[PDB]
């Protein structure tokens, strides 16, 4: 609480200009924050999601979502609280890594690709290392610092676990990006994220291809039980692949832990051209 950590904004220190984008859980914009008085002007992107004390989270989410000192997680700059919640963060230009690998399929090299992976992983690690639960990790939910540096974002879907919590109990989060207990059992775990991360990787690997595309968001379970998983990424040696399909295991505490994904990736990284096969 108090007068420190998590700056709240008087609804006048920022103007909504053009609409950067509208998601399922809200229509984010891109305005300018004028720290009341402080002749200093700032350009950012407003996050006016739309949905009770379900704000305890939002608040507790941001509460740590700002307590960031990692180069891979869009520190929550500030917050807006009216009759409708809004968030601010140091705006990025390029955008969501999906748009990126979509404008550069025939331009990204193994290098970065294997990298992001590790970076993304580093980040998912620090949140895990701070009793957090992302819930919805995806190419879209990740911003581009530089092709050599990427960060993760939030629309406050996370939630901070309280000392005795191991799993979170429940917008909507696209079905296709979540584990099986998340669908079938409205359950959110440090491990479910891993599974989300496997999809992410898939995307990037397939250069942001639509996971499952063609097969309704209904059967994903129907087949997820039948032991069906995303196809293999053409540019992916049957060695990269395995760490992915591995996070999609049915047993949840049998999957690759975050610290780990970094290890096997901070390794592959050491020889990109060896695990991926891209012409250019």
């Amino acid at each position: 609480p108090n007068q420190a950590l998590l700056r709240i904004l008087k609804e006048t220190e920022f103007k909504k200009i053009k609409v950067l984008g509208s998601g399922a859980f809200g229509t984010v914009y891109k305005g300018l924050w004028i720290p009341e008085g402080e002749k200093v002007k700032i350009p950012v992107a407003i996050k006016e999601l739309r949905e009770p004390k379900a704000n305890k989270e939002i608040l507790d989410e941001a509460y740590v979502m700002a307590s960031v000192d990692n180069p891979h997680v869009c520190r929550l700059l500030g917050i807006c609280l009216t009759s409708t919640v809004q968030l601010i963060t140091q705006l990025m230009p390029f955008g969501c890594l999906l748009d990126y690998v979509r404008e550069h399929k025939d331009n990204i090299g193994s290098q970065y690709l294997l990298n992001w992976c590790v970076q993304i992983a580093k980040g998912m690690n620090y949140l895990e290392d701070r009793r957090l639960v992302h819930r919805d990790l995806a190419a879209r939910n990740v911003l581009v610092k530089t092709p050599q540096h990427v960060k993760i974002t939030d629309f406050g879907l996370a939630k901070l676990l309280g000392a005795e919590e191991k799993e979170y109990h429940a917008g909507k989060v696209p079905i296709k990006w979540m584990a099986l207990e998340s669908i079938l059992h409205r359950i959110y775990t440090h491990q479910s994220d891993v599974w989300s991360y496997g999809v992410t990787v898939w995307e990037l690997m397939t250069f942001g291809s639509k996971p499952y595309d063609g097969i309704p968001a209904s059967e994903i379970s129907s087949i997820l039980e039948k032991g069906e998983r995303l196809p293999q990424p053409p540019i992916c040696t049957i060695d990269v692949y395995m760490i992915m399909v591995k996070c999609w295991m049915i047993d949840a505490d049998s999957r690759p832990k975050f610290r780990e994904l970094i290890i096997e990736f901070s390794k592959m990284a050491r020889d990109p051209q060896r695990y991926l096969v891209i012409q250019g």
Binding site: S209, L230, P231, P233, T237, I238, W248, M249, I250, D251
Partner: peptide, 27 residues
């Protein structure tokens, strides 16, 4: 050394992993 031999880059909607029980559920 180890890539998918798809028939015209055609990457299928799904890759099956059954009967493995690490991916196939008790149901």
């Amino acid at each position: 050394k180890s890539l998918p031999s798809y028939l015209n880059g055609v990457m299928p909607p799904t890759q099956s992993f059954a009967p493995d029980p690490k991916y196939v559920s008790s149901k």
